[PDB]
Coordinates of C-alpha atoms and ligand atoms in Angstrom, one line a residue:
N1 CA -34.5 9.5 15.0
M2 CA -37.6 6.5 14.6
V3 CA -36.7 5.5 10.7
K4 CA -38.6 2.1 8.9
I5 CA -37.0 -1.0 7.8
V6 CA -38.0 -1.4 4.0
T7 CA -37.1 -4.5 1.9
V8 CA -36.1 -3.0 -1.8
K9 CA -36.1 -6.0 -4.7
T10 CA -32.9 -5.6 -6.7
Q11 CA -31.2 -7.1 -9.5
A12 CA -27.8 -8.2 -9.2
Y13 CA -24.9 -7.4 -11.8
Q14 CA -21.8 -10.0 -12.0
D15 CA -19.1 -8.2 -11.9
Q16 CA -18.9 -7.7 -7.9
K17 CA -15.9 -9.0 -7.4
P18 CA -14.1 -7.7 -4.8
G19 CA -10.2 -8.4 -4.6
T20 CA -7.7 -8.0 -2.7
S21 CA -7.6 -4.1 -2.6
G22 CA -11.5 -3.6 -2.9
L23 CA -14.6 -3.6 -5.9
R24 CA -13.1 -0.2 -8.1
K25 CA -15.2 1.1 -10.6
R26 CA -15.5 4.3 -12.5
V27 CA -17.7 6.4 -10.5
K28 CA -20.3 6.7 -13.4
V29 CA -20.5 2.9 -12.9
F30 CA -22.1 3.7 -9.0
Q31 CA -24.1 6.0 -9.9
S32 CA -25.9 5.1 -13.4
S33 CA -26.3 1.6 -12.1
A34 CA -29.6 1.0 -10.4
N35 CA -28.5 -0.5 -6.9
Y36 CA -24.6 -1.4 -7.7
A37 CA -23.2 -0.1 -4.3
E38 CA -26.6 -1.2 -2.1
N39 CA -26.4 -4.7 -4.0
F40 CA -22.5 -4.4 -2.7
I41 CA -23.0 -3.5 0.3
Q42 CA -25.9 -5.4 1.0
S43 CA -23.4 -8.7 0.2
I44 CA -20.7 -7.6 2.6
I45 CA -23.0 -7.3 5.7
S46 CA -24.7 -10.3 4.6
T47 CA -21.5 -12.4 5.1
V48 CA -22.1 -11.5 9.1
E49 CA -24.0 -13.6 10.8
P50 CA -27.5 -12.7 12.0
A51 CA -26.9 -14.0 15.4
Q52 CA -23.6 -11.8 15.7
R53 CA -24.8 -8.2 14.0
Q54 CA -26.4 -6.4 17.0
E55 CA -22.7 -6.4 19.1
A56 CA -20.7 -6.2 16.4
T57 CA -19.2 -3.0 15.3
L58 CA -18.4 -1.6 11.3
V59 CA -15.4 0.9 10.7
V60 CA -16.3 3.2 8.3
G61 CA -14.5 5.4 6.3
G62 CA -12.6 6.4 3.4
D63 CA -10.5 8.8 1.1
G64 CA -12.5 11.6 0.7
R65 CA -13.6 11.4 -2.9
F66 CA -16.4 12.2 -4.9
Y67 CA -19.7 9.7 -4.4
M68 CA -17.3 9.1 -0.5
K69 CA -20.2 10.3 1.3
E70 CA -23.0 9.0 -0.3
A71 CA -21.5 5.9 -0.2
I72 CA -21.3 6.3 3.8
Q73 CA -25.3 7.5 4.3
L74 CA -26.1 4.1 2.1
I75 CA -23.8 2.2 4.4
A76 CA -24.9 3.0 7.2
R77 CA -28.9 2.9 5.4
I78 CA -28.4 -0.8 4.5
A79 CA -26.1 -1.5 7.9
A80 CA -28.9 -0.5 10.1
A81 CA -31.8 -2.5 8.5
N82 CA -29.6 -5.6 8.9
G83 CA -29.1 -5.6 13.0
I84 CA -25.4 -4.2 12.4
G85 CA -25.2 -2.9 16.1
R86 CA -22.6 0.5 15.4
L87 CA -20.8 1.9 13.3
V88 CA -17.7 3.7 14.0
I89 CA -17.1 6.8 11.1
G90 CA -15.1 9.4 10.8
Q91 CA -15.6 12.4 10.8
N92 CA -16.5 14.1 7.6
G93 CA -16.8 10.3 6.6
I94 CA -12.4 10.7 6.3
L95 CA -10.7 8.0 7.5
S96 CA -6.8 6.7 6.5
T97 CA -6.4 3.5 5.5
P98 CA -3.9 2.7 8.7
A99 CA -6.4 4.8 10.4
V100 CA -9.3 2.3 9.8
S101 CA -7.0 -0.3 11.1
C102 CA -5.9 1.1 13.9
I103 CA -9.2 1.2 14.9
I104 CA -10.3 -1.9 14.2
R105 CA -7.8 -3.3 16.6
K106 CA -8.4 -1.0 19.2
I107 CA -11.7 -1.1 19.2
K108 CA -12.2 -4.7 18.3
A109 CA -15.1 -4.4 15.6
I110 CA -15.7 -7.2 13.2
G111 CA -13.9 -5.5 10.5
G112 CA -14.1 -2.4 8.1
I113 CA -16.0 -0.6 4.9
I114 CA -13.3 1.3 3.5
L115 CA -14.4 3.8 0.9
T116 CA -11.2 4.5 -1.1
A117 CA -8.9 3.4 -4.9
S118 CA -5.8 4.0 -3.3
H119 CA -4.0 5.5 -6.0
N120 CA -6.4 5.9 -8.5
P121 CA -8.4 9.9 -9.7
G122 CA -11.1 10.6 -7.5
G123 CA -14.4 13.2 -8.7
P124 CA -17.0 12.8 -11.1
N125 CA -15.5 11.5 -14.0
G126 CA -12.4 9.6 -11.3
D127 CA -12.9 6.3 -10.2
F128 CA -14.3 4.5 -6.8
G129 CA -13.8 1.7 -4.7
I130 CA -14.9 -0.2 -2.1
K131 CA -12.6 -2.0 0.5
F132 CA -13.1 -4.4 3.1
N133 CA -11.4 -5.5 6.3
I134 CA -11.6 -7.7 9.0
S135 CA -11.5 -8.4 12.9
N136 CA -7.4 -7.9 12.7
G137 CA -8.0 -5.2 10.7
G138 CA -6.6 -6.0 7.2
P139 CA -8.0 -6.7 4.1
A140 CA -10.6 -9.0 4.3
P141 CA -9.3 -12.7 2.7
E142 CA -9.4 -14.6 -0.5
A143 CA -12.0 -17.0 1.3
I144 CA -14.4 -13.9 2.3
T145 CA -14.4 -12.0 -0.9
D146 CA -14.8 -15.0 -2.5
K147 CA -18.1 -15.7 -0.7
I148 CA -19.4 -11.4 -1.6
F149 CA -19.3 -12.2 -5.5
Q150 CA -21.4 -14.9 -5.1
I151 CA -23.5 -13.0 -3.0
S152 CA -23.7 -10.5 -5.2
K153 CA -24.4 -12.2 -8.3
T154 CA -27.5 -14.0 -7.3
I155 CA -28.9 -11.5 -5.2
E156 CA -32.7 -10.5 -5.0
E157 CA -32.9 -7.8 -2.4
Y158 CA -32.1 -6.2 0.5
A159 CA -32.7 -4.4 3.5
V160 CA -32.5 -0.6 4.3
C161 CA -33.9 1.8 6.4
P162 CA -34.3 4.9 3.6
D163 CA -35.2 7.7 5.8
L164 CA -31.8 7.1 8.1
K165 CA -29.1 10.0 7.7
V166 CA -26.1 10.3 9.7
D167 CA -24.5 13.9 9.8
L168 CA -20.7 12.7 8.8
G169 CA -19.7 16.5 10.4
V170 CA -20.4 16.4 14.4
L171 CA -19.2 14.2 16.6
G172 CA -20.1 11.8 19.0
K173 CA -23.0 9.4 19.2
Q174 CA -26.1 9.5 17.0
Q175 CA -28.6 6.6 17.8
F176 CA -31.3 5.6 15.1
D177 CA -34.3 3.9 16.9
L178 CA -35.4 0.9 14.1
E179 CA -38.9 0.9 13.9
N180 CA -40.4 -2.3 15.3
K181 CA -36.3 -3.4 16.7
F182 CA -35.7 -3.3 20.0
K183 CA -32.5 -2.3 20.0
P184 CA -31.0 0.5 18.7
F185 CA -28.9 1.3 15.8
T186 CA -25.6 3.8 16.7
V187 CA -23.5 5.7 15.0
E188 CA -20.2 7.5 16.6
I189 CA -18.4 10.3 14.7
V190 CA -14.4 10.0 16.1
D191 CA -12.2 12.5 15.0
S192 CA -10.8 11.7 12.0
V193 CA -7.2 11.8 13.3
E194 CA -7.2 11.1 17.1
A195 CA -7.1 7.3 17.7
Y196 CA -4.3 7.0 15.2
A197 CA -2.5 10.0 16.7
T198 CA -2.3 8.0 19.3
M199 CA -1.1 4.9 18.3
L200 CA 1.9 7.0 17.0
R201 CA 2.0 8.9 19.6
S202 CA 2.9 5.3 21.6
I203 CA 4.9 3.6 18.7
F204 CA 7.3 7.1 18.4
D205 CA 9.1 9.3 20.3
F206 CA 6.9 12.5 20.7
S207 CA 9.3 14.6 21.8
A208 CA 11.9 13.9 20.1
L209 CA 10.3 14.9 17.4
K210 CA 9.4 17.9 18.8
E211 CA 12.8 18.4 19.4
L212 CA 13.3 17.7 16.2
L213 CA 11.3 19.5 14.3
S214 CA 11.1 23.0 16.2
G215 CA 12.8 25.9 16.8
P216 CA 15.7 27.8 15.1
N217 CA 18.2 24.8 14.2
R218 CA 14.7 22.2 12.7
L219 CA 15.1 19.7 10.5
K220 CA 13.3 21.4 7.3
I221 CA 10.4 19.0 6.0
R222 CA 7.7 18.9 3.1
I223 CA 5.2 16.4 3.8
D224 CA 2.9 15.8 0.4
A225 CA -0.7 14.5 0.9
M226 CA -1.3 14.7 -2.5
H227 CA -5.1 16.5 -1.8
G228 CA -5.7 13.3 -0.4
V229 CA -7.2 11.7 2.8
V230 CA -3.2 11.7 4.7
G231 CA -4.0 15.8 5.0
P232 CA -5.3 16.4 8.0
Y233 CA -3.1 14.1 10.3
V234 CA -0.2 15.4 8.5
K235 CA -1.7 18.9 9.4
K236 CA -2.7 18.1 12.9
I237 CA 0.1 15.5 13.9
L238 CA 3.0 16.9 12.6
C239 CA 2.5 20.5 12.6
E240 CA 0.2 21.1 15.3
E241 CA 2.2 18.6 18.3
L242 CA 5.2 18.4 16.2
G243 CA 5.3 21.3 15.7
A244 CA 6.9 21.3 12.3
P245 CA 5.7 24.8 11.0
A246 CA 2.2 24.7 8.4
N247 CA 3.6 25.3 5.3
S248 CA 5.2 21.9 5.9
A249 CA 2.3 20.5 4.8
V250 CA 1.9 20.9 1.6
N251 CA -1.7 19.7 -0.3
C252 CA -2.6 19.0 3.0
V253 CA -6.8 19.7 2.7
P254 CA -8.7 16.6 1.5
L255 CA -10.0 17.3 -1.9
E256 CA -13.0 15.6 -3.9
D257 CA -10.6 15.7 -6.7
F258 CA -8.1 15.2 -5.5
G259 CA -6.9 18.4 -7.2
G260 CA -7.3 17.2 -10.5
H261 CA -4.4 14.6 -10.5
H262 CA -3.4 10.7 -9.2
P263 CA -2.7 11.2 -5.6
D264 CA 0.1 8.3 -6.3
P265 CA 3.6 9.1 -5.0
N266 CA 6.3 8.7 -7.3
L267 CA 8.8 11.7 -8.8
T268 CA 6.8 12.4 -11.3
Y269 CA 2.9 12.4 -10.1
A270 CA 4.6 14.1 -7.0
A271 CA 6.3 16.1 -9.2
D272 CA 5.4 19.6 -8.0
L273 CA 7.3 18.3 -4.4
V274 CA 10.3 16.9 -6.6
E275 CA 10.8 20.7 -7.3
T276 CA 10.5 21.7 -3.9
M277 CA 13.0 19.8 -2.7
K278 CA 14.8 20.5 -5.9
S279 CA 15.6 24.2 -4.0
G280 CA 18.0 22.9 -1.9
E281 CA 15.6 24.0 1.2
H282 CA 14.6 21.7 2.8
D283 CA 16.1 18.7 4.3
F284 CA 13.5 15.9 4.4
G285 CA 9.9 15.5 1.8
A286 CA 7.6 12.8 1.7
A287 CA 4.3 11.6 -0.4
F288 CA 1.6 10.0 -0.2
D289 CA -1.2 8.3 -2.0
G290 CA -4.8 9.0 -1.6
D291 CA -5.7 6.5 1.4
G292 CA -2.3 7.0 2.8
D293 CA -0.8 3.4 3.0
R294 CA 2.2 4.2 0.6
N295 CA 4.9 6.7 0.6
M296 CA 8.0 8.3 -1.9
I297 CA 10.9 9.2 0.4
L298 CA 13.5 12.4 -0.7
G299 CA 16.2 14.3 0.7
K300 CA 17.7 17.2 0.6
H301 CA 18.3 18.9 -3.2
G302 CA 15.2 16.0 -4.5
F303 CA 17.7 12.7 -3.5
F304 CA 15.4 9.9 -4.0
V305 CA 15.1 7.0 -2.0
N306 CA 14.2 4.4 -3.3
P307 CA 11.6 2.6 -1.6
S308 CA 13.6 -0.9 -1.7
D309 CA 16.6 1.2 0.2
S310 CA 14.1 2.6 2.3
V311 CA 13.3 -0.5 4.5
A312 CA 16.3 -1.4 3.8
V313 CA 17.8 1.9 6.4
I314 CA 14.5 1.8 8.2
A315 CA 15.7 -2.3 9.0
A316 CA 19.2 -1.3 10.1
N317 CA 18.5 1.6 12.6
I318 CA 15.2 0.5 13.5
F319 CA 15.9 1.0 17.3
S320 CA 16.1 4.4 16.7
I321 CA 11.8 3.9 17.3
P322 CA 10.7 3.1 20.8
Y323 CA 7.9 0.7 19.4
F324 CA 10.5 -1.8 18.6
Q325 CA 13.1 -1.2 20.9
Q326 CA 10.3 -2.9 23.3
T327 CA 9.1 -5.5 20.8
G328 CA 12.4 -6.5 20.0
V329 CA 12.8 -7.3 16.1
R330 CA 10.6 -10.4 15.3
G331 CA 11.0 -10.3 11.4
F332 CA 12.1 -8.4 8.4
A333 CA 10.0 -9.2 4.9
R334 CA 9.7 -8.2 1.7
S335 CA 7.4 -8.8 -1.6
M336 CA 9.8 -11.5 -3.7
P337 CA 9.9 -8.3 -6.4
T338 CA 11.6 -5.4 -4.1
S339 CA 15.3 -5.3 -4.2
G340 CA 17.7 -7.0 -1.6
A341 CA 18.9 -4.3 0.1
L342 CA 16.7 -5.4 3.4
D343 CA 18.4 -9.2 3.2
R344 CA 21.5 -7.6 3.3
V345 CA 20.8 -6.0 6.4
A346 CA 18.8 -9.3 8.1
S347 CA 22.1 -11.1 6.8
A348 CA 24.2 -8.8 9.0
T349 CA 21.7 -8.7 12.0
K350 CA 20.8 -12.4 11.8
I351 CA 17.1 -11.8 11.7
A352 CA 14.7 -13.9 9.3
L353 CA 14.2 -12.9 6.3
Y354 CA 11.2 -13.3 4.7
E355 CA 10.0 -13.1 0.6
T356 CA 6.7 -13.3 -0.5
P357 CA 4.6 -13.0 -2.9
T358 CA 2.8 -9.5 -4.2
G359 CA 0.2 -9.5 -1.6
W360 CA -0.7 -8.1 1.5
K361 CA -1.7 -11.9 3.1
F362 CA 1.2 -13.3 3.0
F363 CA 2.9 -10.3 5.6
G364 CA -0.4 -10.2 7.6
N365 CA 0.1 -14.0 8.0
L366 CA 3.8 -13.3 9.2
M367 CA 2.4 -10.9 11.8
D368 CA -0.5 -12.4 13.1
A369 CA 2.6 -15.6 13.9
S370 CA 4.3 -13.1 15.4
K371 CA 7.0 -13.2 13.0
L372 CA 7.5 -10.1 11.4
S373 CA 8.3 -6.7 12.4
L374 CA 9.1 -4.3 9.6
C375 CA 8.0 -5.1 5.6
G376 CA 8.8 -3.2 2.4
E377 CA 7.9 -3.8 -1.5
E378 CA 9.1 -1.6 -4.2
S379 CA 5.5 -0.3 -5.1
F380 CA 6.2 2.7 -2.2
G381 CA 4.8 0.3 0.7
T382 CA 6.1 0.1 3.9
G383 CA 4.6 -0.9 7.1
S384 CA 4.9 -2.7 10.7
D385 CA 3.1 -5.3 12.4
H386 CA 1.6 -2.2 14.1
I387 CA -1.5 -2.5 12.2
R388 CA -2.4 -4.4 9.4
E389 CA -2.5 -2.3 6.8
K390 CA 0.9 -0.7 5.4
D391 CA 1.2 2.8 6.7
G392 CA 2.5 5.9 4.8
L393 CA 2.4 8.3 7.0
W394 CA 4.3 6.1 10.1
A395 CA 7.2 5.4 7.2
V396 CA 7.8 8.8 7.0
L397 CA 7.3 9.0 11.4
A398 CA 10.0 6.6 11.1
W399 CA 12.3 8.1 8.5
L400 CA 12.6 11.4 11.3
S401 CA 12.9 9.2 14.5
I402 CA 16.0 8.1 12.5
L403 CA 17.8 11.1 11.2
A404 CA 17.1 12.5 14.7
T405 CA 18.9 10.2 16.4
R406 CA 21.8 9.9 13.3
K407 CA 22.4 14.1 13.0
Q408 CA 23.2 13.6 9.7
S409 CA 21.5 13.6 6.3
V410 CA 18.8 11.7 4.2
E411 CA 21.5 11.2 2.0
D412 CA 24.1 11.1 4.2
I413 CA 22.4 7.9 5.7
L414 CA 21.7 6.7 1.9
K415 CA 25.5 7.1 1.4
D416 CA 27.1 5.8 4.5
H417 CA 24.4 2.5 4.3
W418 CA 25.3 2.0 0.4
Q419 CA 29.4 1.3 2.2
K420 CA 28.4 -1.0 4.4
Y421 CA 26.2 -3.1 3.4
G422 CA 27.0 -2.4 -0.7
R423 CA 24.2 -0.9 -2.8
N424 CA 21.5 -2.6 -4.4
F425 CA 21.1 -0.5 -7.7
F426 CA 17.1 -1.1 -8.9
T427 CA 14.5 -0.3 -11.4
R428 CA 10.9 -1.2 -12.1
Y429 CA 10.1 -1.4 -15.9
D430 CA 6.7 -0.8 -16.6
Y431 CA 5.3 -1.6 -20.0
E432 CA 1.5 -0.9 -19.9
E433 CA -1.5 -2.4 -22.3
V434 CA 0.3 -5.6 -24.3
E435 CA -1.2 -6.9 -26.0
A436 CA -2.0 -10.0 -24.0
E437 CA -1.3 -13.1 -25.5
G438 CA 2.5 -11.9 -27.3
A439 CA 2.9 -10.9 -23.4
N440 CA 2.1 -14.0 -22.5
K441 CA 4.0 -16.7 -24.4
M442 CA 7.2 -14.2 -24.1
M443 CA 7.2 -15.5 -20.5
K444 CA 6.2 -18.8 -21.2
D445 CA 9.2 -18.6 -23.8
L446 CA 11.1 -17.1 -20.9
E447 CA 9.9 -20.3 -18.5
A448 CA 10.9 -22.6 -20.7
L449 CA 14.4 -21.3 -21.3
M450 CA 15.0 -20.9 -17.5
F451 CA 13.8 -24.2 -16.6
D452 CA 16.8 -26.4 -19.3
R453 CA 19.1 -28.0 -17.1
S454 CA 22.3 -25.9 -19.0
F455 CA 20.4 -22.5 -17.9
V456 CA 22.2 -22.3 -14.8
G457 CA 25.7 -21.6 -15.3
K458 CA 25.2 -19.8 -18.0
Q459 CA 27.4 -16.1 -18.4
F460 CA 26.5 -13.0 -19.7
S461 CA 28.7 -10.5 -20.6
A462 CA 28.0 -6.0 -20.1
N463 CA 30.1 -4.5 -20.9
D464 CA 32.8 -5.1 -18.1
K465 CA 30.4 -6.9 -15.9
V466 CA 30.6 -11.1 -15.8
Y467 CA 27.0 -12.3 -15.0
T468 CA 26.5 -16.2 -14.2
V469 CA 22.9 -17.7 -13.4
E470 CA 22.9 -19.2 -10.0
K471 CA 19.1 -19.9 -10.2
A472 CA 16.2 -19.7 -12.5
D473 CA 12.3 -20.9 -11.9
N474 CA 8.7 -19.3 -11.7
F475 CA 8.5 -18.1 -8.2
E476 CA 6.5 -20.3 -5.6
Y477 CA 5.9 -19.4 -2.0
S478 CA 4.8 -22.0 0.4
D479 CA 3.3 -20.1 3.2
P480 CA 4.3 -21.4 6.6
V481 CA 0.6 -20.0 8.6
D482 CA -2.1 -21.1 6.8
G483 CA -0.4 -23.7 4.4
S484 CA -1.3 -22.1 1.0
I485 CA 1.0 -22.4 -2.2
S486 CA 1.0 -19.3 -4.5
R487 CA 2.3 -20.7 -8.1
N488 CA 3.6 -18.7 -11.0
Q489 CA 4.7 -15.7 -9.0
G490 CA 7.2 -14.7 -11.2
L491 CA 10.1 -15.4 -13.1
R492 CA 13.6 -14.7 -11.5
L493 CA 17.2 -14.8 -12.7
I494 CA 19.3 -14.7 -10.3
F495 CA 22.9 -14.2 -10.8
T496 CA 25.8 -16.0 -8.4
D497 CA 27.1 -12.1 -7.6
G498 CA 23.6 -11.0 -5.7
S499 CA 22.1 -9.2 -8.5
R500 CA 18.8 -10.3 -10.0
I501 CA 15.6 -10.1 -13.1
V502 CA 11.9 -10.5 -12.4
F503 CA 9.4 -10.5 -15.1
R504 CA 5.8 -10.5 -13.6
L505 CA 2.8 -10.2 -15.7
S506 CA -0.1 -8.6 -14.9
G507 CA -4.0 -10.0 -14.9
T508 CA -5.7 -8.8 -18.4
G509 CA -7.3 -5.8 -18.6
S510 CA -10.0 -4.1 -21.5
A511 CA -6.7 -2.4 -22.6
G512 CA -4.3 -4.9 -21.9
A513 CA -1.8 -6.2 -19.1
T514 CA 1.4 -5.0 -17.5
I515 CA 4.7 -6.3 -18.2
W516 CA 6.5 -5.5 -14.8
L517 CA 10.3 -6.1 -15.0
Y518 CA 12.4 -5.4 -12.0
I519 CA 16.2 -5.0 -12.7
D520 CA 18.2 -5.3 -9.5
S521 CA 22.0 -4.9 -9.8
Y522 CA 24.4 -5.6 -6.6
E523 CA 27.6 -3.5 -6.1
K524 CA 30.1 -3.1 -3.3
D525 CA 33.1 -1.2 -5.4
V526 CA 33.4 2.3 -3.7
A527 CA 34.0 3.2 -7.1
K528 CA 30.6 2.0 -8.0
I529 CA 28.2 2.6 -5.6
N530 CA 27.6 6.3 -6.1
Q531 CA 27.2 6.0 -10.1
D532 CA 24.0 7.4 -12.0
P533 CA 22.0 4.0 -11.0
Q534 CA 20.4 3.6 -14.6
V535 CA 23.3 3.5 -15.5
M536 CA 24.5 1.3 -13.9
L537 CA 21.7 -0.9 -14.8
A538 CA 22.0 -1.2 -18.2
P539 CA 24.2 -4.5 -18.1
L540 CA 21.6 -6.2 -16.9
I541 CA 18.8 -4.3 -18.7
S542 CA 20.5 -5.5 -21.6
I543 CA 20.6 -8.8 -20.8
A544 CA 17.0 -9.1 -19.1
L545 CA 15.4 -8.0 -22.6
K546 CA 17.7 -10.0 -25.0
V547 CA 17.0 -13.0 -23.4
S548 CA 13.1 -12.0 -22.7
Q549 CA 13.0 -11.2 -26.2
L550 CA 10.3 -8.3 -24.7
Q551 CA 10.4 -6.2 -27.9
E552 CA 10.6 -9.1 -30.8
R553 CA 7.4 -10.1 -28.4
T554 CA 5.8 -7.4 -27.9
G555 CA 7.2 -4.4 -30.5
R556 CA 8.3 -1.8 -27.0
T557 CA 11.3 -0.4 -27.5
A558 CA 11.4 1.2 -24.7
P559 CA 9.1 1.2 -20.9
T560 CA 6.3 3.2 -20.5
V561 CA 7.0 4.2 -16.8
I562 CA 10.7 4.3 -15.1
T563 CA 10.7 4.1 -11.7
Ligands
MG1 MG1 -3.2 3.1 -0.9

């Protein structure tokens, strides 16, 4: 109850860069490096003005992976010693990334610390992540993560209450009296799901969804949390409140090692869900990543809704969702490599479409300007301005709301969509661990080729299709809110028929770089829109590999992953 504040001398580390997704390291790094976690937590809290700490609340929680609770205890001991007045912590330390964003905004917290490495594996031999969100409920922007890093590199001591221990398992308020400090340190343990469920209860029509999911003629669903943080949310919202049978909740017990697998939703990492769906018994399936901000959507027989189409379908049926009936649609956005399916809906309904570089900050900026209602990313990301993170379970309830109004199968909705708007066939080729010098040379040579005055207007044939270059550039974005200019965001080959090829190159890691090749082939012919996507995409894939000389530059004859 009564705990001393002490100062611990420490030695700085040089690599504690918080990034856009948080600081991620192997669990063993956190465990084997003295004061690695403590240094970073202190560096985060040192960005808060001492004058504002006593009245500050930080929201703290994470995805359940191994080392989470130890990290949360460290956060409490250091926050208390530094004069932070209050932590709000999910029970057992569990809060999904959307729940943290929800709670920060609801209670007007100064920010939050999220213990997640998202889709990356967890366990004693896995990864651990520490993510900092600020008072709008969203990721800390570059100016703040830069400051955290700078503090991190020269820190020589931190303040900690070594004897402070939070009971994470019991709801309610725990007060800690600090030696020679007048005001107490307060920890509120909250139910992990309540505030987030109460938010969804206002966004969606739970009465309609209960009727959809309960009884004999119910929509049958299988919702796979991949042993990660969304598990209790599925059970308490979809099963207990909305009445889906308990077997609807798949892998919905959080596990410290996510069951020994990557909690990353795609057709192969969630192969178990796909195989379940292939039996034809269920109408709808979905999978979430480890912290719940990404989602994969499946139909009957395992029909795959690609994420670029998913956001377009939600846009096209958006007033099935009570939230948007009330706010109206303020704008649509997608990352630049995401397929142009959303644009077709925006153009037809005459709503602004913002095409942003990859990254949350561009969406958050537009949402904060009241210009963005619905956003999507080809990397299994979908969100709205209800919070300032993407939200996988929200996307599922959006889909369920649309199924309830349309009274059609997932696949029939997509087929109707393609008939109405045409189809953006879409795939992403990932070339992993490529040698970075050759990959960079590939990009620079391709960019030079695209910059030549004769490149626009050039025609590529294969085999029954002629593509004509309409525009070719290295994508640049001037942010209309904060004035920043983002350059070198991706090579775009834009064709007169609505199709595109996009190349992006990752930064260089210890195993090399990743080349991302996105192929977006637009088709309106009824005899073409229901064909196999990799068959319909083969012409543009051939053109992309030829013009980039990817095989010649990298030695790769095939991508590592196809999505
Ligand atoms: Mg995630």
